[PDB]
Enzyme design. Sequence first.
Site, PDB file in Angstrom:
ATOM      1  N   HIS A  51      29.061-111.007   9.601  1.00  0.00           N
ATOM      2  CA  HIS A  51      29.001-110.255   8.318  1.00  0.00           C
ATOM      3  C   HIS A  51      30.204-110.454   7.415  1.00  0.00           C
ATOM      4  O   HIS A  51      29.983-110.345   5.997  1.00  0.00           O
ATOM      5  CB  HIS A  51      28.364-108.874   8.424  1.00  0.00           C
ATOM      6  N   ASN A 105      23.659-103.536   6.187  1.00  0.00           N
ATOM      7  CA  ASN A 105      25.174-103.122   6.874  1.00  0.00           C
ATOM      8  C   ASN A 105      24.693-101.497   7.339  1.00  0.00           C
ATOM      9  O   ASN A 105      25.424-101.248   8.384  1.00  0.00           O
ATOM     10  CB  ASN A 105      26.234-103.353   5.950  1.00  0.00           C
ATOM     11  N   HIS A 114      22.088-113.431  19.506  1.00  0.00           N
ATOM     12  CA  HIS A 114      20.953-112.490  19.632  1.00  0.00           C
ATOM     13  C   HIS A 114      20.589-112.624  21.003  1.00  0.00           C
ATOM     14  O   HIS A 114      19.608-111.757  21.543  1.00  0.00           O
ATOM     15  CB  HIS A 114      19.924-112.883  18.739  1.00  0.00           C
ATOM     16  N   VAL A 132      21.153-105.419  19.800  1.00  0.00           N
ATOM     17  CA  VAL A 132      19.752-104.769  19.394  1.00  0.00           C
ATOM     18  C   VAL A 132      19.385-104.887  17.963  1.00  0.00           C
ATOM     19  O   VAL A 132      20.103-105.258  17.288  1.00  0.00           O
ATOM     20  CB  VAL A 132      19.759-103.256  19.627  1.00  0.00           C
ATOM     21  N   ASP A 182      17.427-109.649  23.100  1.00  0.00           N
ATOM     22  CA  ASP A 182      16.762-110.678  24.412  1.00  0.00           C
ATOM     23  C   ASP A 182      16.281-109.658  25.433  1.00  0.00           C
ATOM     24  O   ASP A 182      16.920-109.046  26.085  1.00  0.00           O
ATOM     25  CB  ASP A 182      18.107-111.248  24.566  1.00  0.00           C
TER      26      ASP A 182
END
Length: 304
Positions: free
Chosen positions: A42, A70, A169, A173, A223
Amino acid sequence: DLQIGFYNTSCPTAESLVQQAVAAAFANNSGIAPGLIRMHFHDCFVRGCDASVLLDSTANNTAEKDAIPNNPSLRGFEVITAAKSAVEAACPQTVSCADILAFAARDSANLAGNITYQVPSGRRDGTVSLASEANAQIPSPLFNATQLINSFANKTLTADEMVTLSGAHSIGVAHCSSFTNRLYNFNSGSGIDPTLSPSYAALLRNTCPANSTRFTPITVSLDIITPSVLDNMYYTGVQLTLGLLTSDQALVTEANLSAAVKANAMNLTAWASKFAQAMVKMGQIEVLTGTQGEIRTNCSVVNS
Ligand SMILES: *[C@@H]1O[C@H](CO)[C@@H](O[C@@H]2O[C@H](CO)[C@@H](O[C@H]3O[C@H](CO[C@@H]4O[C@H](CO)[C@H](O)[C@H]4O)[C@@H](O)[C@H](O[C@H]4O[C@H](CO)[C@@H](O)[C@H](O)[C@@H]4O)[C@@H]3O[C@H]3O[C@H](CO)[C@@H](O)[C@H](O)[C@@H]3O)[C@H](O)[C@H]2NC(C)=O)[C@H](O[C@@H]2O[C@@H](C)[C@@H](O)[C@@H](O)[C@@H]2O)[C@H]1NC(C)=O
Ligand SMILES: *[C@@H]1O[C@H](CO)[C@@H](O[C@@H]2O[C@H](CO)[C@@H](O[C@H]3O[C@H](CO)[C@@H](O)[C@H](O[C@@H]4O[C@H](CO)[C@@H](O)[C@H](O)[C@@H]4O)[C@@H]3O[C@H]3O[C@H](CO)[C@@H](O)[C@H](O)[C@@H]3O)[C@H](O)[C@H]2NC(C)=O)[C@H](O[C@@H]2O[C@@H](C)[C@@H](O)[C@@H](O)[C@@H]2O)[C@H]1NC(C)=O
Ligand SMILES: *[C@@H]1O[C@H](CO)[C@@H](O[C@@H]2O[C@H](CO)[C@@H](O[C@@H]3O[C@H](CO)[C@@H](O)[C@H](O)[C@@H]3O[C@H]3O[C@H](CO)[C@@H](O)[C@H](O)[C@@H]3O)[C@H](O)[C@H]2NC(C)=O)[C@H](O[C@@H]2O[C@@H](C)[C@@H](O)[C@@H](O)[C@@H]2O)[C@H]1NC(C)=O
Ligand code: HEM
Ligand SMILES: *[C@@H]1O[C@H](CO)[C@@H](O[C@@H]2O[C@H](CO)[C@@H](O)[C@H](O)[C@H]2NC(C)=O)[C@H](O[C@@H]2O[C@@H](C)[C@@H](O)[C@@H](O)[C@@H]2O)[C@H]1NC(C)=O
Ligand SMILES: *[C@@H]1O[C@H](CO)[C@@H](O[C@@H]2O[C@H](CO)[C@@H](O)[C@H](O)[C@H]2NC(C)=O)[C@H](O[C@@H]2O[C@@H](C)[C@@H](O)[C@@H](O)[C@@H]2O)[C@H]1NC(C)=O
Ligand SMILES: *[C@@H]1O[C@H](CO)[C@@H](O[C@@H]2O[C@H](CO)[C@@H](O)[C@H](O)[C@H]2NC(C)=O)[C@H](O)[C@H]1NC(C)=O
Ligand SMILES: *[C@@H]1O[C@H](CO)[C@@H](O)[C@H](O)[C@H]1NC(C)=O
Ligand SMILES: *[C@@H]1O[C@H](CO)[C@@H](O)[C@H](O)[C@H]1NC(C)=O
Ligand SMILES: *[C@H]1O[C@H](CO)[C@@H](O)[C@H](O)[C@H]1NC(C)=O
Ligand SMILES: [Ca+2]
Ligand SMILES: [Ca+2]
């Protein structure tokens, strides 16, 4: 340009100090690893890797922190603060917050997946941070393949590098609100995204209410296979209709992306090497160098 070991002379222990702060925080809460990797992403996608994402909002400025993507999902700010505290004590006004964040993401990849690499440094800290820019520049999980590719292309990253980096990823979460679009009122008979396993969907529905927002404190591992290991199982899941985000599943909706997903799922060593390389490339997006910007002393506020 950025160089590995920029602090060889000015702060020999800079990177070890950061790693020790990250390691301590990780022992306390493993979630800081995905938190910091995402935070570095980010940073790099808004005004380049210049620590702009770290700045707190003030009376006259609504900073990136408060942008939709964010707030409140970003996490790990305290680790950066702790690392910065140590580094400032060891080498006053020397090491940039931007470099610390890049170092910390690398340390996180090592802790979460034994993926390690050297990080070019010498980044400088910017003095601008706007929620409006983060709102516009951070990719949406609702994006399709074309939109994801275009987003990343504008940030110097190839379609394949986008697929590689999406493998982040493999840990961490997502809030319910980031994928409820696939669970309720989808344009289908069941109201569920047909590209999501109906059995996975059923369980997700029992966990995530349709009225979830970004502030609803319910999160789900990205995942389902190895939620805390930064490995290639993210890709395995994506191929099996177990990709969680719309943008995750997007990776198998186009020939070239699907081939990359397949290749990554088949070979951990190969993907891990590409991930390290892609992280290094990401960490050099639109960086400030030399005398540009400043060395921010308190990562949460511009120098005065
Ligand atoms: C901060 O401090 C670190 C640690 O010193 C710096 O990183 C190291 O930087 C050195 C160069 O300064 C680098 O040394 C070798 O580069 C290549 C490596 O090559 C791959 O491996 C094989 C080797 O056969 C193949 O050649 C390459 O594909 C070597 O080619 C090179 O050696 C040749 O060059 C030497 C010296 O010029 C000559 O003998 C001859 O011309 C050769 O052709 C370097 O070699 C090695 O020389 C040492 C002599 O004492 C030897 O003892 C040892 O084997 C050494 O490797 C290191 O690999 C690198 N270390 C690591 C862990 O990455 C760092 O420098 C920055 O970052 C590095 C990666 C480079 O990008 C630098 O340009 C850059 O400045 C320091 N940071 C700063 C900002 O100063
Ligand atoms: C690294 O940088 C960050 C970001 O700047 C900094 O965190 C901020 O710290 C300030 C205090 O320096 C903090 O301000 C408020 O705390 C209360 C919030 O309600 C409030 O009581 C207080 O109001 C006051 O200050 C003025 C003058 O003294 C008077 O109105 C009152 O007497 C009162 O004391 C603080 O202020 C508001 O004041 C500003 C006036 O210009 C106003 O514009 C702001 O809205 C501000 O809220 C501020 O909330 C805080 N920012 C955030 C987002 O947390 C770090 O400071 C350290 O951590 C903080 C959390 C505090 O614990 C602080 O004591 C710590 O020093 C800074 N790190 C370091 C080590 O300096
Ligand atoms: C091991 O990990 C856990 C989980 O991170 C740590 O617990 C947390 O500590 C933070 C403070 O560092 C707590 O945040 C505060 O919550 C207050 C009440 O809501 C807020 O007023 C305050 O601002 C803090 O909140 C938000 O603050 C940031 C803004 O500046 C935000 O970026 C961020 O979103 C944060 O939520 C947090 O509530 C707490 N979490 C839990 C589940 O307890 C833990 O830290 C230590 O132990 C905790 C319990 C507290 O005692 C802390 O003071 C203490 O540092 C950490 N162990 C460590 C680091 O020792
Ligand atoms: C390719 C486009 C991408 C999209 C659309 C996207 C979107 C998202 C969303 C919506 C979340 C969940 C946020 C939440 O609801 O809490 C998330 C989580 C996460 N993302 Fe991405 N992301 C993308 C790429 C990346 C990249 C490039 C990285 C890093 C290299 C990354 C790292 C992470 C991490 C580590 C998490 C879990 C964070 C945590 O647990 O704190 N993502 N992503
Ligand atoms: C992925 O999202 C894109 C939106 O950013 C879609 O493309 C755009 O589609 C719009 C359809 O109404 C159109 O107005 C825009 O001009 C176009 N923009 C471009 C060129 O990127 C894209 O949709 C497909 O491709 C476009 C060009 C049209 O042919 C659409 O009808 C197609 O559906 C989305 N991809 C898919 C597979 O849906
Ligand atoms: C968001 O969706 C939730 C799931 O439907 C709502 O909660 C549920 O509301 C039912 C009555 O509308 C109640 O019988 C269920 O027990 C309850 N389930 C749970 C897990 O809370 C929720 O509604 C709010 O919260 C509930 C508890 C009541 O206070 C309602 O009056 C509230 O509206 C929805 N929240 C919002 C903001 O609408
Ligand atoms: C899985 O990926 C690894 C890493 O790319 C492969 O290992 C290397 O193999 C390639 C073959 O083209 C060589 O070019 C590299 O020099 C090797 N490097 C490393 C890191 O060992 C490995 O071959 C792949 N496994 C399979 C079964 O295809
Ligand atoms: C991690 O990586 C190193 C090589 O860099 C290897 O020697 C070690 O066995 C690996 N195992 C872990 C996860 O510690
Ligand atoms: C990407 O950024 C914008 C378009 O969104 C534009 O100003 C610029 O020329 C584009 N080119 C890059 C940086 O790839
Ligand atoms: C992969 O897909 C792209 C875009 O669809 C296409 O242009 C390209 O030719 C394909 N493979 C390559 C690298 O040739
Ligand atoms: Ca930035
Ligand atoms: Ca995993």
